[PDB]
Design a protein around this ligand. Sequence first.
Ligand SMILES: [Mg+2]
Ligand SMILES: [Mg+2]
Ligand SMILES: [Mg+2]
Ligand SMILES: [Mg+2]
Ligand SMILES: [Mg+2]
Ligand SMILES: [Mg+2]
Ligand SMILES: [Mg+2]
Ligand SMILES: [Mg+2]
Ligand SMILES: [Mg+2]
Ligand SMILES: [Mg+2]
Ligand SMILES: [Mg+2]
Ligand SMILES: [Mg+2]
Ligand SMILES: [Mg+2]
Ligand SMILES: [Mg+2]
Ligand SMILES: [Zn+2]
Lengths: 259, 52, 129, 129, 199, 191, 137
Amino acid sequence: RGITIKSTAISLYSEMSDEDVKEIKQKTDGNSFLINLIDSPGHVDFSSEVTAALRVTDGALVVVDTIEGVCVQTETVLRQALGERIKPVVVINKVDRALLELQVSKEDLYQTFARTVESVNVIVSTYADEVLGDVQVYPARGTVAFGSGLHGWAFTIRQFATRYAKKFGVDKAKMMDRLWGDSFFNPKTKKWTNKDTDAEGKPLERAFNMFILDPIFRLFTAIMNFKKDEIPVLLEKLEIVLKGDEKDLEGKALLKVVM
Amino acid sequence: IIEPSLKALASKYNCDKSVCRKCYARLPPRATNCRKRKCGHTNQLRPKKKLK
Amino acid sequence: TYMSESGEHIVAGTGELHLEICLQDLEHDHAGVPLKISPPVVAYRETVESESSQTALSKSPNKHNRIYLKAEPIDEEVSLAIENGIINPRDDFKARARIMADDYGWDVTDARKIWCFGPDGNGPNLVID
Amino acid sequence: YAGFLLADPKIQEPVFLVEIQCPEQAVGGIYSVLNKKRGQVVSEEQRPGTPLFTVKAYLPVNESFGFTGELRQATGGQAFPQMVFDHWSTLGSDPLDPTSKAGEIVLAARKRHGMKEEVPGWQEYYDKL
Amino acid sequence: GIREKKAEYFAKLREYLEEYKSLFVVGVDNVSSQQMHEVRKELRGRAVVLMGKNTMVRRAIRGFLSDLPDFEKLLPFVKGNVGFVFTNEPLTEIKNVIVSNRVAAPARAGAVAPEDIWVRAVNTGMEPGKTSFFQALGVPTKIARGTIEIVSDVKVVDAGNKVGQSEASLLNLLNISPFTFGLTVVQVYDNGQVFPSSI
Amino acid sequence: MKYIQTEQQIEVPEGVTVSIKSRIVKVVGPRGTLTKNLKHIDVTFTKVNNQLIKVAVHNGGRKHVAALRTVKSLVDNMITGVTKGYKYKMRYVYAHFPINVNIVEKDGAKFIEVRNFLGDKKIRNVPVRDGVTIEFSTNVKDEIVLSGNSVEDVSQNAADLQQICRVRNKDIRKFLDGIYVSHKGFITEDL
Amino acid sequence: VKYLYLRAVGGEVGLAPKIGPLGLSPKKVGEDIAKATKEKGIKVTVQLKIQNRQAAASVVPSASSLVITALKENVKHSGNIQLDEIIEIARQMRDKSFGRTLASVTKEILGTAQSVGCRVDFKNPHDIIEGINAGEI
RNA sequence: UUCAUCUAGACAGCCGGACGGUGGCCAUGGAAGUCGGAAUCCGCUAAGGAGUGUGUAACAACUCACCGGCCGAAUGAACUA
Ligand SMILES: [Mg+2]
Ligand SMILES: [Mg+2]
Ligand SMILES: [Mg+2]
Ligand SMILES: [Mg+2]
Ligand SMILES: [Mg+2]
Ligand SMILES: [Mg+2]
Ligand SMILES: [Mg+2]
Ligand SMILES: [Mg+2]
Ligand SMILES: [Mg+2]
Ligand SMILES: [Mg+2]
Ligand SMILES: [Mg+2]
Ligand SMILES: [Mg+2]
Ligand SMILES: [Mg+2]
Ligand SMILES: [Mg+2]
Ligand SMILES: [Zn+2]
């Protein structure tokens, strides 16, 4: 039937690179971590298997279909977590829906994400324990993700900040904040702004769309429009291993493997 | 969804009408008779039901 | 799960499909026997609103014994006592005929003359001589 | 039985006490479902800071079958019922009148139990002398 | 009646006209029924206000010129939703009361716009839950102290365009307008002199 | 009831020249010429002063006189379109599947092409009637404008488009998707 | 920014914490100060609290309904009064109400809100409003 | 056929206002004109029902009678065959 009915557990063993554990803002040993996971059911009829799993856990990974937005059961499973005093983080999932079904545009997409996060923090502030309080989640805090499970991909803004310490020199700290909200870059003006600022006519795209989104849209349309020579050259400036017989397919499921 | 403006727009053509209580014809919202010969251009009309 | 007031085995679920999966689980694993599903029956009670607009004549099979009576409703105050255990059948009267007279608009002369409760001997239906 | 039937016989039905949580955005649908099913509100209180109204209401367990389904269809899934027995309720509706929605109950209860359609009138159980 | 009630009005008109030589014609539009009652009895000494249908008040002082033809230099200003304030108190006091009521027009009804309407930054104070109203237009909300806070000042309505009730109900049900509406002064009278808005 | 004479006066402005023989009426102004055959109406015209024209019905029943005011409006709409033009704007309305609208040309076609209506795989084609000019408004999301001199030909052309997105088989007060006329006006807007 | 919130009615001491939780106030203190403000006073009256972010000021905003029932003694209709003196006292307490240009036009409105109650010793209101003409304080 | 409105500006359309005692009385788990009975008063008015609808859980919010601005000549209702 393709619906989780009982919430079932699995403990995952996974590593972390030496620079990643440095950011962990709580006392933290070693480099390997042990993830005790529970896959929960959405249906209200099974909410008893959520409270049964939220009594035995400490944080919660909350998933929001990007196109469907935050929905009624999103709302009530959250009230289940914040009652049990559980910290949330969010994956905005299922984005490949937005590029295909909705033909969405980069700004069309960013602003989809904003109001979605706005929606969750409303739920978070109303019911989060005034004892702990501050626990709202924000993308430049590194507490929001973006992707689609069925294509096995995802990203955070922090991951994009680190890759840009290498290539364009600068440090990451002034990338996080720059990569969200209204911060822009103005090509051949080589200078950031701190509002929309319009550049006295013709406003430019936020850093989020320019440095993060534009990579994926460029990919998508080449593959889907079957652009047979643009794709081989997108190999170079992103350092992606095309393999062998895997290079020997049309578009379609080509996108799901490259991503 | 539909920005409430363009929902109000499509509602002008789709919802905000009336119905001949005799022959079901879809009629202007503030009409007073049916235009159809088949029901003797009856004046017996009623609003087209607004959903929710 | 529990037995119904009217003796049915009851499975109380959370929704129609929560009930769906509880039930099919019941027939295959937990019980492992074919099953039949019904809407539970509702228990009712039979009671009088008024006081028996005419005394009740009723003769016996041989034409020798005749019994007369009238019937009336007990104040819900009272029936909630019998059910909650104030007015016992195993309690001796007077002591029990006291609490009835002082607190229920009752008449201790009657409350001593209770014979039995009903049904099962501990139910909220009284008989007065 | 004769005296019984002379005392304006009625029947008592089980009545649940229903507590529903729901946000103000949707509590209208709670009221509309209780109306079809002879519901009867007693309480209504917003929880402070939350939208989250709670509604305490009086559902005859009679009408409760299908209810929580009909309930969360009317609230778009946002309403959370929870019931318990509360009390027995008497229906002024006449039991021996099959037309009235107490005679419907007894008439149905009569057939499935396997006896005669409508109850012997009070004429029987009585002896004129 | 046919003309008896319309003539009750003519009666109260010459009444005021001869008693007071100073006068105020006032533009009464986008005004409120309460807004009128505010100080309609402000200076019970000499300050009063009355109005009716123009087309009937033209026929009154039309026939009031065989006897006292000195108010003929008043008809050109009876042409819209205009009424009258008869006073003899110092004429500068009245102008600075009448204009100074200004109900402040809250807010819109999907009507038309003055100019670029902007929403500022800083914390609105609205409880989170009104957040839906802020998302409706596209302002980036963010819940700071248990209250909605706007970031990134954005223009909600453009230069004089048809506003939508989603935008209106944000300004209206929540914020400041800033459309505002009071009474106005079209002209003044003082013993046959037609003074404009000067002092 | 046989009204003995009723007439309507057609206010003809500066730049235009109109011409009536039989009842064919050619009317040409700043933006071109237009024509109507009316040998189906039985009226007579009278040029009074080169900036006015009388339309007259003699001895006419209720239905006949009804036609008279309609001819005033018809010809009046020719002079208006030939000076100021007409511009019909339409917005596409959709709840989920964005409507794709372009213009395409097979054998000089200029057809309005509608793809993805409610997710359809069918592609709808509305030809563009002659003399209407279809430009997609920039800066207004999902707005198409049709414009030209013949209000008949632009409005019928907009009807065609609005009706090719009639939504079948569902509850159209829920499924409000379609392409609906939003603003009826003039080309050189002005008045 | 002193709060100004007008509440419901009651008579003695007596569920409105959903509007005062953001006000950081005790859903025990508020009803304990209101029973003080609701003194007459055992009838049903409109109340208005102004809030100072800690504690609440229970004022009783004089209602035309509330006043006339204090002057009076199935249906709790207390419609047996007179005291056209007492009626006159209400209208002064109306205190720039109805916009009345006279102290009588304000006693023409308190006396008209006699929906259920005797205006004169053996008379009704809305008939005892005439050239009866007294009391212009 | 009968009765009404109109150059003292009607009908239509558009447009501004649609108040204040007041959340009026009995109720009601709640009912603030708008589930329902009973009341149908007053004030201030150019006029605005103790309410024509839509609406709310209850307010809110729109709407209408009613008044007015606009226009400028006739027009409205109920019947008959
Ligand atoms: Mg499925
Ligand atoms: Mg889906
Ligand atoms: Mg039944
Ligand atoms: Mg049933
Ligand atoms: Mg269907
Ligand atoms: Mg005339
Ligand atoms: Mg009129
Ligand atoms: Mg008119
Ligand atoms: Mg009511
Ligand atoms: Mg209501
Ligand atoms: Mg009265
Ligand atoms: Mg009133
Ligand atoms: Mg209101
Ligand atoms: Mg009218
Ligand atoms: Zn018909």
